Amino acid sequence: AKLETVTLGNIGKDGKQTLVLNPRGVNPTNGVASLSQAGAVPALEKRVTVSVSQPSRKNYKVQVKIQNPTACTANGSCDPSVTRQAYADVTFSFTQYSTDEERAFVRTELAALLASPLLIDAIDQLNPA
Amino acid sequence: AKLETVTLGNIGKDGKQTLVLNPRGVNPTNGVASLSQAGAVPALEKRVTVSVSQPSRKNYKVQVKIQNPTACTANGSCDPSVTRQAYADVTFSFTQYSTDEERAFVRTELAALLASPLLIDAIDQLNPA
Amino acid sequence: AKLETVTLGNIGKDGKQTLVLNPRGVNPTNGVASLSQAGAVPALEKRVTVSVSQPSRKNYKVQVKIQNPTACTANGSCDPSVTRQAYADVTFSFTQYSTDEERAFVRTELAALLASPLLIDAIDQLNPA
Amino acid sequence: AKLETVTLGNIGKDGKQTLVLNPRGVNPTNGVASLSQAGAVPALEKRVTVSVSQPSRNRKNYKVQVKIQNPTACTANGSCDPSVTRQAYADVTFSFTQYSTDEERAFVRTELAALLASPLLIDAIDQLNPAY
Amino acid sequence: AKLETVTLGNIGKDGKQTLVLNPRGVNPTNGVASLSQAGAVPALEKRVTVSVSQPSRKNYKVQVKIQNPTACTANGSCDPSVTRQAYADVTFSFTQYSTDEERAFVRTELAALLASPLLIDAIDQLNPA
Amino acid sequence: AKLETVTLGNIGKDGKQTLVLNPRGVNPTNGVASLSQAGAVPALEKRVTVSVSQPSRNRKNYKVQVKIQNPTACTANGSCDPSVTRQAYADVTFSFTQYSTDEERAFVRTELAALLASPLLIDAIDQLNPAY
């Protein structure tokens, strides 16, 4: 669709957060759209980069990269810097004949594991299975 | 945590689906756990493979691969075969000092985009941004 | 005992089946008896091969192999062919001093697990433990 | 399924026995689950080890493999703690091609679960008489 | 048993401490379970690793390793680092015929020396005997 | 401190036991102290060997190392003097960097002295159940 201010709601371990993402245009060299938090220091922005790569491999590759840096202001300078860069990547794939449901069943599945008690115990605490 | 029957609920484009995933043991050669649908043809099972790779790169890599094949029974044989293999991949990353929140804020974020009107228009229909 | 038409009754996931096995003589090169279904295409017969190997290792090895092929007629040809070959193997073992009970307690045990809710969930659906 | 206390009932040549098997966790190095009798001497326990080996780059076939194992204790010896004299193994290694349907499996289970009670094997195991 | 939040109570030289250890899954390559403090910097976590190695040597080896790092923040940097790594190891052993009591008498013994006035004078102050 | 009769109390799975350990001198070749039960057959004694190894030119870390050892006596045999059948060892090898404070040590002692009584180990030692 058209890039708009995605108001991601109810995020965070407690589930009471917000995250607005202003659009940031489509980098035309690789078709990678981008979003970003309104945080007005553009090396400390929660970035989100969606994209779709049409067959050139014969498979659509919806690829959502998000990226959350953390700012460690304290001691010795004034402008905060980037200490930890907590990436996160999602690279779907779909054969040319992938129906409408066989896709929206991989989306909501991966959108349901990431809230199931198997992953919030395998990401929020890095406990393996 | 411990692998159990993850009863992923309310999936699918319409939002009225279920998907139970019986545990399938931890492949010890690479620490990759696995889940699978109760669908009793084990080349037609909706597979899900979580894993966590401790620092050996100095970054934890929670990597959730899911995989949904589709079965095209009709014409000419009896046992259905695998026609389309609609993959989906998620490879997080976290620096050794990644706090508890800086992780559970990348999980629920990626678990909220995949339900936001930006991706269900960029996956369910492959419309780019 | 003497090979006879073993009328295996109440088989199958539903428990309402029959399976008659006509004797098929004792292959003398290795003492391996054999049974077989009355299905009159002798490359599509549910085979069963019992045997006992006296000490030559100092341990009796009762070894029951059964074997169920499936016939996929719809092909392009007339005579059905063997597509899947669903083996199954049982190799007991008993020390020379194995009493009468210490054997008939390994038989009926293995004959009770294969009907317990631990295996008909670990064979009929390949769910591991 | 989930490992639980499998209360195997009606076992033994006479058919009047019980055998409870407490779960014993999944050895993670090879995915081999394990059960065991409540017999509280852990070198004299009737062990049972189920497992399922998913297709890897060595074979494309599921291998449900149930090993059971019954040792016998010969106390009267000269010592106090009983020892393991005879180790009456028993092995079951199924196999199923990737396309093995639900019935083509539960028909190999209950078959092998019906021979082991048919008058052909309880005369070829309980007495080691071969087939003749 | 099943890994759970072990709430180790009444620890420390004064005896008024707590230490909760969230489970951290069973590393399947070597069967070594793991616990960890809720301290949300996963290179500064009080780790505890239990394990049991079945006969492959003919002796069970219950092996409990615990490990307490200390964080020296004041440095010149922002993210604290690991200065001292105060290990501690316990490797039991038991012959295949080890009864139930002959084990729970080595546990509680070693669990009673470590509180007797012989060791809290040979660990808390490194005074030899 | 000084080796004395350590009267370890409230031991055993039931928690109602005693175990007195008379001192047994410091083997000077390696600085390994030793204790022992008053059981007056000195190949059937519950041994306990503490030691501290100061930093040498092989490692810069104190290594408090407590080995205990409980043999069991199987009299009934054919002979008169009981013999050693099972040798149920147990080992504890701490470690501490030269700058290890007083608390960072007495917090590893009482921790390891609290796990060995927590419901995670008395289910992973008294029954050898691994963690699952």
Side-chain angles (χ1 to χ4, degrees), chain A residues 1-15 17-55 59-74 76-129, chain B residues 1-15 17-55 59-74 76-129, chain C residues 1-15 17-55 59-74 76-129, chain D residues 1-15 17-55 61-76 78-132, chain E residues 1-15 17-55 59-74 76-129, chain F residues 1-15 17-55 61-76 78-132:
Chain A
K2 184 178 179 181
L3 296 174
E4 292 179 353
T5 62
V6 178
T7 62
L8 295 172
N10 292 320
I11 310 173
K13 184 176 72 175
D14 61 355
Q17 291 290 323
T18 60
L19 183 64
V20 297
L21 296 178
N22 299 116
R24 292 288 298 274
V26 177
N27 184 1
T29 61
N30 58 8
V32 173
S34 297
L35 301 179
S36 175
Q37 189 182 7
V41 180
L44 298 177
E45 293 178 352
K46 309 292 181 66
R47 292 179 180 177
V48 175
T49 64
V50 303
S51 67
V52 294
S53 296
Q54 297 182 358
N59 296 320
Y60 293 89
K61 292 183 181 179
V62 178
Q63 180 172 1
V64 174
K65 291 183 180 180
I66 70 96
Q67 181 175 1
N68 305 120
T70 60
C72 183
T73 62
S77 178
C78 63
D79 290 332
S81 64
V82 175
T83 301
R84 298 184 299 274
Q85 194 68 255
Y87 295 100
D89 184 356
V90 174
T91 66
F92 295 102
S93 178
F94 299 102
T95 305
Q96 293 178 356
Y97 296 97
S98 302
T99 63
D100 192 358
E101 294 178 353
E102 293 180 356
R103 291 188 296 273
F105 183 77
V106 175
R107 179 180 62 84
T108 60
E109 182 179 3
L110 183 60
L113 293 180
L114 296 176
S116 67
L118 186 277
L119 290 176
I120 59 170
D121 188 75
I123 293 173
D124 288 332
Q125 297 177 358
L126 281 75
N127 290 319
Chain B
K2 184 178 179 181
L3 296 174
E4 292 179 353
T5 62
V6 178
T7 62
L8 295 172
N10 292 320
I11 310 173
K13 184 176 72 175
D14 61 355
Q17 291 290 323
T18 60
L19 183 64
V20 297
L21 296 178
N22 299 116
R24 292 288 298 274
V26 177
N27 184 1
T29 61
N30 58 8
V32 173
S34 297
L35 301 179
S36 175
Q37 189 182 7
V41 180
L44 298 177
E45 293 178 352
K46 309 292 181 66
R47 292 179 180 177
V48 175
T49 64
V50 303
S51 67
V52 294
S53 296
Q54 297 182 358
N59 296 320
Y60 293 89
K61 292 183 181 179
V62 178
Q63 180 172 1
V64 174
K65 291 183 180 180
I66 70 96
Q67 181 175 1
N68 305 120
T70 60
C72 183
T73 62
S77 178
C78 63
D79 290 332
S81 64
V82 175
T83 301
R84 298 184 299 274
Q85 194 68 255
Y87 295 100
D89 184 356
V90 174
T91 66
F92 295 102
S93 178
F94 299 102
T95 305
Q96 293 178 356
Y97 296 97
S98 302
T99 63
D100 192 358
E101 294 178 353
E102 293 180 356
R103 291 188 296 273
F105 183 77
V106 175
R107 179 180 62 84
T108 60
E109 182 179 3
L110 183 60
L113 293 180
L114 296 176
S116 67
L118 186 277
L119 290 176
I120 59 170
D121 188 75
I123 293 173
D124 288 332
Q125 297 177 358
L126 281 75
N127 290 319
Chain C
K2 184 178 179 181
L3 296 174
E4 292 179 353
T5 62
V6 178
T7 62
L8 295 172
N10 293 320
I11 310 173
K13 184 176 72 175
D14 61 355
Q17 291 290 323
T18 60
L19 183 64
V20 297
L21 296 178
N22 299 116
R24 292 288 298 274
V26 177
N27 184 1
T29 61
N30 58 8
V32 173
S34 297
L35 301 179
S36 175
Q37 189 182 6
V41 180
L44 299 177
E45 293 179 352
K46 309 292 181 66
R47 292 179 180 177
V48 175
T49 64
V50 303
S51 67
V52 294
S53 296
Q54 297 182 358
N59 296 320
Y60 293 89
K61 292 182 181 179
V62 178
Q63 180 173 1
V64 173
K65 291 183 180 180
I66 70 96
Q67 181 175 1
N68 305 120
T70 60
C72 183
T73 61
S77 178
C78 63
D79 290 332
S81 65
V82 175
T83 301
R84 298 184 299 274
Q85 194 68 255
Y87 295 100
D89 184 356
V90 174
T91 66
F92 295 103
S93 178
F94 299 102
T95 305
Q96 293 178 356
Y97 296 97
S98 302
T99 63
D100 192 358
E101 294 178 353
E102 293 180 356
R103 291 188 296 273
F105 183 77
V106 175
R107 179 181 62 84
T108 60
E109 182 179 2
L110 183 60
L113 293 180
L114 296 176
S116 67
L118 186 277
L119 290 176
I120 59 170
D121 188 75
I123 293 173
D124 288 332
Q125 297 177 358
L126 281 75
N127 290 319
Chain D
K2 184 178 179 181
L3 296 174
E4 292 179 353
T5 62
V6 178
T7 62
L8 295 172
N10 293 320
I11 310 173
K13 184 176 72 175
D14 61 355
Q17 291 290 323
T18 60
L19 183 64
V20 297
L21 296 178
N22 299 116
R24 292 288 298 274
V26 177
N27 184 1
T29 61
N30 58 8
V32 173
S34 297
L35 301 179
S36 175
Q37 189 181 6
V41 180
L44 299 177
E45 293 178 352
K46 309 292 181 66
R47 292 179 180 177
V48 175
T49 64
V50 303
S51 66
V52 294
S53 296
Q54 297 182 358
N61 296 320
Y62 293 89
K63 292 182 181 179
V64 178
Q65 180 173 1
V66 174
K67 291 183 180 180
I68 70 96
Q69 181 175 1
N70 305 120
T72 60
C74 183
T75 62
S79 178
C80 63
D81 290 332
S83 64
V84 175
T85 301
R86 298 184 299 274
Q87 194 68 255
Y89 295 100
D91 184 356
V92 174
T93 66
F94 295 103
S95 178
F96 299 102
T97 305
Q98 293 178 356
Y99 296 97
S100 302
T101 63
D102 192 358
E103 294 178 353
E104 293 180 356
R105 291 189 296 272
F107 183 77
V108 175
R109 179 180 62 84
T110 60
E111 182 179 3
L112 183 60
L115 293 180
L116 296 176
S118 67
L120 186 277
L121 290 176
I122 59 170
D123 188 75
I125 293 173
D126 288 332
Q127 297 177 358
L128 281 76
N129 290 319
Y132 180 75
Chain E
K2 184 178 179 181
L3 296 174
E4 292 179 353
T5 62
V6 178
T7 62
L8 295 172
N10 293 320
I11 310 173
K13 184 176 72 175
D14 61 355
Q17 291 290 323
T18 60
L19 183 64
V20 297
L21 296 178
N22 299 116
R24 292 288 298 274
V26 177
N27 184 1
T29 61
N30 58 8
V32 173
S34 297
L35 301 179
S36 175
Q37 189 182 6
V41 180
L44 299 177
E45 293 179 352
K46 309 292 181 66
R47 292 179 180 177
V48 175
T49 64
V50 303
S51 67
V52 294
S53 296
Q54 297 182 358
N59 296 320
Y60 293 89
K61 292 182 181 179
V62 178
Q63 180 173 1
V64 173
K65 291 183 180 180
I66 70 96
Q67 181 175 1
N68 305 120
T70 60
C72 183
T73 61
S77 178
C78 63
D79 290 332
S81 65
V82 175
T83 301
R84 298 184 299 274
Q85 194 68 255
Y87 295 100
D89 184 356
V90 174
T91 66
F92 295 103
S93 178
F94 299 102
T95 305
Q96 293 178 356
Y97 296 97
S98 302
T99 63
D100 192 358
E101 294 178 353
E102 293 180 356
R103 291 188 296 273
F105 183 77
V106 175
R107 179 181 62 84
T108 60
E109 182 179 2
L110 183 60
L113 293 180
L114 296 176
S116 67
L118 186 277
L119 290 176
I120 59 170
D121 188 75
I123 293 173
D124 288 332
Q125 297 177 358
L126 281 75
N127 290 319
Chain F
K2 184 178 179 181
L3 296 174
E4 292 179 353
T5 62
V6 178
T7 62
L8 295 172
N10 293 320
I11 310 173
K13 184 176 72 175
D14 61 355
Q17 291 290 323
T18 60
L19 183 64
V20 297
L21 296 178
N22 299 117
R24 292 288 298 274
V26 177
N27 184 1
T29 61
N30 58 8
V32 173
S34 297
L35 301 179
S36 175
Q37 189 181 6
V41 180
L44 299 177
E45 293 179 352
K46 309 292 181 66
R47 292 179 180 177
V48 175
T49 64
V50 303
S51 66
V52 294
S53 296
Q54 297 182 358
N61 296 320
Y62 293 89
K63 292 182 181 179
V64 178
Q65 180 173 1
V66 174
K67 291 183 180 180
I68 70 96
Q69 181 175 1
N70 305 120
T72 60
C74 183
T75 62
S79 178
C80 63
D81 290 332
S83 64
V84 175
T85 301
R86 298 184 299 274
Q87 194 68 255
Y89 295 100
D91 184 356
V92 174
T93 66
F94 295 103
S95 178
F96 299 102
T97 305
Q98 293 178 356
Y99 296 97
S100 302
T101 63
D102 192 358
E103 294 178 353
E104 293 180 356
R105 291 189 296 272
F107 183 77
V108 175
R109 179 180 62 84
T110 60
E111 182 179 3
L112 183 60
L115 293 180
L116 296 176
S118 67
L120 186 277
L121 290 176
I122 59 170
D123 188 75
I125 293 173
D126 288 332
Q127 297 177 358
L128 281 76
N129 290 319
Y132 180 75

